[PDB]
Design a protein around this motif. Sequence first.
Motif, PDB file in Angstrom:
ATOM      1  N   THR A 130       0.802  -1.374   0.181  1.00  0.00           N
ATOM      2  CA  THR A 130      -0.446  -0.558  -0.116  1.00  0.00           C
ATOM      3  C   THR A 130       1.043   1.297  -0.098  1.00  0.00           C
ATOM      4  O   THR A 130       1.491   1.299   0.854  1.00  0.00           O
ATOM      5  N   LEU A 131       0.772   1.707  -0.964  1.00  0.00           N
ATOM      6  CA  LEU A 131       1.674   3.293  -0.573  1.00  0.00           C
ATOM      7  C   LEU A 131       0.910   4.464  -1.848  1.00  0.00           C
ATOM      8  O   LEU A 131       1.487   3.829  -3.579  1.00  0.00           O
ATOM      9  N   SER A 132       0.581   5.422  -1.750  1.00  0.00           N
ATOM     10  CA  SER A 132      -0.608   5.850  -2.745  1.00  0.00           C
ATOM     11  C   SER A 132      -0.468   7.480  -2.644  1.00  0.00           C
ATOM     12  O   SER A 132      -0.572   7.874  -0.776  1.00  0.00           O
ATOM     13  N   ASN A 133      -0.541   8.579  -3.309  1.00  0.00           N
ATOM     14  CA  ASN A 133      -0.815   9.956  -2.823  1.00  0.00           C
ATOM     15  C   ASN A 133      -2.390  10.468  -3.168  1.00  0.00           C
ATOM     16  O   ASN A 133      -3.307  10.608  -2.965  1.00  0.00           O
ATOM     17  N   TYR A 134      -2.157  10.848  -4.980  1.00  0.00           N
ATOM     18  CA  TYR A 134      -3.349  11.433  -4.331  1.00  0.00           C
ATOM     19  C   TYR A 134      -2.799  12.550  -6.605  1.00  0.00           C
ATOM     20  O   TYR A 134      -2.301  13.212  -5.633  1.00  0.00           O
ATOM     21  N   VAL A 135      -3.260  12.443  -7.227  1.00  0.00           N
ATOM     22  CA  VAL A 135      -2.733  12.342  -8.719  1.00  0.00           C
ATOM     23  C   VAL A 135      -3.701  14.139  -9.394  1.00  0.00           C
ATOM     24  O   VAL A 135      -3.277  14.416  -9.702  1.00  0.00           O
ATOM     25  N   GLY A 136      -4.667  13.754  -8.411  1.00  0.00           N
ATOM     26  CA  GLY A 136      -5.841  14.637  -8.867  1.00  0.00           C
ATOM     27  C   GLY A 136      -7.287  14.885 -10.036  1.00  0.00           C
ATOM     28  O   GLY A 136      -7.734  13.431  -9.988  1.00  0.00           O
ATOM     29  N   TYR A 137      -6.411  15.330 -11.025  1.00  0.00           N
ATOM     30  CA  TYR A 137      -7.211  15.897 -12.113  1.00  0.00           C
ATOM     31  C   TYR A 137      -7.032  14.627 -12.944  1.00  0.00           C
ATOM     32  O   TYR A 137      -7.384  13.798 -14.231  1.00  0.00           O
ATOM     33  N   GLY A 138      -4.976  14.940 -13.113  1.00  0.00           N
ATOM     34  CA  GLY A 138      -4.972  14.286 -14.428  1.00  0.00           C
ATOM     35  C   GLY A 138      -3.449  15.196 -15.248  1.00  0.00           C
ATOM     36  O   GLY A 138      -2.986  15.126 -15.934  1.00  0.00           O
TER      37      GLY A 138
END
Length: 139
Positions: A130-138
């Motif tokens: 498990t390791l994630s952040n947030y790309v947002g819209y792209g």
Amino acid sequence: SAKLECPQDWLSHRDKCFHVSQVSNTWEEGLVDCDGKGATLMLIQDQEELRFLLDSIKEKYNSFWIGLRYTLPDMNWKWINGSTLNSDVLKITGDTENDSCAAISGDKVTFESCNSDNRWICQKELYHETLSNYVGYGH
């Protein structure tokens, strides 16, 4: 690199082993199809993973379901096994507000409706992460 062992019909990479099914199904079906081998639908860990996918995939330009589901509410992508998408690897949306699941298409990751007739990748677990952040819209 076999952390643990997997069957011969599978390609081992670090701490998982993969099977690229060139036959088509929906995302949901391929998921269940992976369960059939006592495996899971592909849970991408890193870039080495996808690079090794590209080596096994070879053709590239198809579309292969991986265990990527956009989870709400959180606007991150979790995997079916409870792992969390390394969003920092390739193009995937962070916030989309859809039931979109992701598939390998080309050298990249793409996303579409789970109901399309695409092929699928199974991985037979040695480990999970498990390791994630947030790309947002792209963007």
